[PDB]
Design a protein around this ligand. Structure first.
Ligand code: QXF
Ligand code: K
Ligand code: K
Ligand code: ZN
Length: 353
């Protein structure tokens, strides 16, 4: 009945040498870690060590070409780092980037291992750079390797190929990389909530719309919950969980839950423009704890208001530790989004009928 926590200060070394105010800051993870100490959560957790992912583990989801290219950045001069980062959509690279990406992934593997071997019930991973925009063959959106997708495959690699893994992605952006990696896969249920604005919101693709339900044997196993029409918050996230996330998850019956836990839908976030509260994130966490016999790993993705992400992620950890949850009308367009997803998924999930 133990909660694991992984954090390693070495993941601060990845930085933007041309713009020190770029919002994907080293101090995102140190601020979150400090808040856990201040709230006396850290001493309640079992500390899981970080490690490097191996290149073989990266190949669970990424091409050997992509791995090779990111690894080559380790010894590049600034000019070539700039050139390489510019080949991608919204990437900056320093000499430390590759090692940090490997540590973020390795940290999550050790956390998944700790859960699946019964050393801990659940776990939190305070890691950067983030993962969910990274594709098999490319980096994107501050992400180099898809930490959460790699973690699902790593979990399968130590149990069975068909281990049922639910990934709930509540980062305010669509995890395009996670969707694509698992698009034909019925072993990994991908559920994302995200601001969409008919394609105006990053990463600017119709791949994030509610009608993208999965392909082939994966049909029904990709659930996109897209928001349009500006600010959303706790009422809309709670309704999406009540009507969609939780009934689908219960029918899937996952054996492991991974949360692509960006905190950029948080009140105060400059990039997300949403109003989800720390108490909101705590309730979402508590709901997910009802799945998979409590086997939940919370993985940091985005989230840029240092105070907001520190309070919100700490409240999720408080829930994992078994603390009592909070006791908390929708925007019109949110009702429209939820009903669109319900209609898209009723052919696949009896619970929605
Ligand atoms: C071009 S942009 O959209 O303004 N954008 C891309 C972006 C935004 C958010 C995320 C994210 O949080 N993903 N989870 C990833 N990439 C961006 C790029 C560089 C700097 C800033 Cl402030 C914003
Ligand atoms: K998301
Ligand atoms: K899938
Ligand atoms: Zn995000």
């Amino acid at each position: 009945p133990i909660t694991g926590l992984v954090y390693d200060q070495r993941m601060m070394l990845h930085h933007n040498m041309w713009d020190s105010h770029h919002p994907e800051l080293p101090q995102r993870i140190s601020r979150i870690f400090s808040r856990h100490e201040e709230l006396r959560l850290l001493s309640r957790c079992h500390r899981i060590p970080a490690r490097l992912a191996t290149e073989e583990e990266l190949a669970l989801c990424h091409s050997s070409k992509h791995i090779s290219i990111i690894k080559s950045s380790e010894h590049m001069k600034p000019r070539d780092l700039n050139r390489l980062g510019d080949e991608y959509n919204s990437i900056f690279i320093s000499n430390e980037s590759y090692t940090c990406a490997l540590l973020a992934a390795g940290s999550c593997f050790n956390s998944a291992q700790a859960i699946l071997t019964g050393q801990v019930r659940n776990a939190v991973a305070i890691v950067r750079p983030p993962g969910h925009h990274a594709e098999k063959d490319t980096a994107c959106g501050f992400c180099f390797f898809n930490t959460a997708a790699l973690t699902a495959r790593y979990a399968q690699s130590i149990t069975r190929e068909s281990l049922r893994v639910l990934i709930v992605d509540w980062d305010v952006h669509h995890g395009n990389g996670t969707q694509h990696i698992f698009e034909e896969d019925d072993s990994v249920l991908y559920i994302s909530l995200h601001r969409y604005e008919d394609g105006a919101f990053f990463p600017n693709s119709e791949d994030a719309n509610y009608d993208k339900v999965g392909l082939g044997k994966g049909r029904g196993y990709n659930v996109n919950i897209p928001w349009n029409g500006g600010k959303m918050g706790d009422p809309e996230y709670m309704a999406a969980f009540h009507h969609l996330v939780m009934p689908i998850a219960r029918e899937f019956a996952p054996e492991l839950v991974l949360v692509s836990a960006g905190f950029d839908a948080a009140r105060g976030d400059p990039l997300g423009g949403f109003q989800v509260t720390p108490e909101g994130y705590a309730h979402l966490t508590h709901q997910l704890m009802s799945l998979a016999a409590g086997r939940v790993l919370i993985i940091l993705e985005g989230g840029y208001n240092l105070t907001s992400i520190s309070e919100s992620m700490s409240m999720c950890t408080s829930m994992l530790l078994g603390d009592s949850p909070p006791s908390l009308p929708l925007k019109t367009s949110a009702t429209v989004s939820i009903n669109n997803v319900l209609r898209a998924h009723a052919p696949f999930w009896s619970s929605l009928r």
